[PDB]
From a paper:
IL-6 signaling is transmitted through gp130 (2), a transmembrane protein ubiquitously expressed and associated with a variety of cytokine receptors to activate the Janus family of tyrosine kinases (JAK), in particular JAK1, JAK2, and Tyk2 (3, 4). Here we present the crystal structures of IL-6 in complex with two novel IL-6-neutralizing camelid Fab fragments, 61H7 and 68F2 that mimic the interaction of IL-6 with IL-6R.
To better understand the very high affinity of the two antibodies the crystal structures of human IL-6 in complex with 61H7 and 68F2 were determined at 2.4 and 2.9 Å resolution, respectively. In the complex with 68F2, VH (50%) and VL (50%) contribute equally to the large interaction surface (1156 Å2). 68F2 binds on the side of IL-6, contacting the N-terminal part of α-helix 1 and the C-terminal part of α-helix 4 of the four-helix bundle, as well as the long loop between α-helices 1 and 2. This binding interface of 68F2 to a major extent overlaps with site I recognized by IL-6R but is significantly larger by 380 Å2. Indeed, although the IL-6·IL-6R interface only hosts 20 hydrogen bonds and 2 salt bridges, on the IL-6·68F2 interface, 20 hydrogen bonds and 7 salt bridges are found. Similarly, the side chain of Val104 (Kabat numbering 99) of the CDR3 loop of the heavy chain takes over the role of Phe279. Therefore, 68F2 can be seen as a true structural mimic of IL-6R: it occupies the same interaction site with and provides similar key interacting residues to anchor points on the IL-6 surface. Next to Phe229, which accounts for 28% of the interaction surface with IL-6, the other phenylalanine (at position 279) accounts for 20% of the total interface, making it the second most important residue for interaction. This suggests that interactions of these two residues (Tyr32 of VL and Val104 of VH) with site I cavity makes 68F2 an extremely good antagonistic antibody and explains its femtomolar potency as measured in the sensitive bioassay.
Author numbering:
A (entry chain H): 1 to 222
B (entry chain L): 3 to 212
C (entry chain A): 23 to 48, 63 to 134, 140 to 152, 157 to 184
Amino acid sequence: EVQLQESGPGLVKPSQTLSLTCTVSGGSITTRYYAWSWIRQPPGKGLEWMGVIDYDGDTYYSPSLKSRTSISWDTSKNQFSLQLSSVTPEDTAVYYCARDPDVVTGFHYDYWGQGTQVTVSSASTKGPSVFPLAPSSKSTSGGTAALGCLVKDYFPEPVTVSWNSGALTSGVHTFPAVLQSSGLYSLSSVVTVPSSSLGTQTYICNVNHKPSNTKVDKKVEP
Amino acid sequence: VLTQPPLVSGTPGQTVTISCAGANNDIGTYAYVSWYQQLPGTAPKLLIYKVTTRASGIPSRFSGSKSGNTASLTISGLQSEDEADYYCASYRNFNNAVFGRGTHLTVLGQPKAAPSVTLFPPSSEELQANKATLVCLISDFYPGAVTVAWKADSSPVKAGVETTTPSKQSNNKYAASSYLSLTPEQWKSHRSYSCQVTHEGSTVEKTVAP
Amino acid sequence: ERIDKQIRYILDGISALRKETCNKSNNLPKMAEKDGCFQSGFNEETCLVKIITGLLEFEVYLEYLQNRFESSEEQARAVQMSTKVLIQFLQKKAKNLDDPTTNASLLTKLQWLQDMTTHLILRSFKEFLQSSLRALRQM
């Protein structure tokens, strides 16, 4: 259960700043000869290298991304944080944390990083409403049933749906969200199971909407 | 500015090339051309670094090359799972890294696939909350262009409809979502509500009733 | 690797040096495209000369960062003396070609502010030693 993990938010307003933080695990930050990078990815577009902090603790930023960007670190907590000043909806992106195995003989990143979504919006924060979408063997194969969860009316993105606390993963189809006319998001996660299991196996969709701190373990019954 | 072709198609067998055109002060002046593979919903994965050096675990068929200020990437033997976004990176002086837009690799030759439609009626929990939503879930279809038509009995439904743009699955087929919002009285009054999905002139219709 | 292991030794010498002093506070030589230790416009002669010279300018800034102690006088002395060994090594590869008092009239004109002013000298030395290790690894 070892990583390179990013902390939220979430939802940030134009005038406000972006205090994103990455927590290093299974390796010190102060070690030779690493460099800690922030790389962002807008909704549909490409990878953008924001800046680095090496084992020494000396910073280097992108020439267009300077003035606004400042990278800090906390050696005691084994973390390194990013700060983006005066955010614009152009800063709406997936923020990555990454390791350079040796800062002085490469600019290649081996261990990434996983990403926090960060969308810039005047708009508020709405927690989703979870409802069980239960077994229907009408459209599935001979001896199977389809069940899910409707995660309705949430803002912003994303939502993480798991089944039986991350145990059930096979036959799970989580569809990407629909942007409604209201400006809120709605999605469904469907798991294909054997029709005979219905009376025996318990199925619970474990939804999590990080921006609004909403965690819903909705059990799906026939 | 590291120019990569926006899209590159591949024979479901073999082989492809992806170019990364840079300049004197980046790809030129050093050998730090690194390649990254990114499948949808996940973080990019290191494939190649230092123009040719393959990352630990990466197959032999993934090859790295360079001419001048343009590095190329070769995938010798295509598996249906190489369908991903490919990114090149380079060191720009002094202590910077620059990436290309990326290159979407489409593995092609896969046949026409008819859609799998699953229609869910409004849940009793939602109906008590004075709301009604019908969930039409379309999956495993090729090509990725579908038309969704809703019907209150046999009359069409235009208002309260929300349809998604088809996005590729892990199996390289397409998936879509269509939601129909109603009032609990509207759901009760009609005999049946149906989801009609049109794909390559063929129709799949799932019906649900209170 | 008597050249990778070298720079790195000196690099780790600076890393340990910044610490004894960054723990109280809390136009230097630089590589261009024309210097050619760059895969494109590569002249092993314009740059082998660029290193020695840069290393020779840096190797005199550490004659301030000497009478700038003496709580870690050998970590301070070893950085200077280890750089002299690196210059000799690179001169042995080279063939002659390239002022302390320039840097004296210049290191005054520039002058916690005495650490702020040591930080960049050692950070710029770290930055240059990186550009040389990179420059050398190709040739």
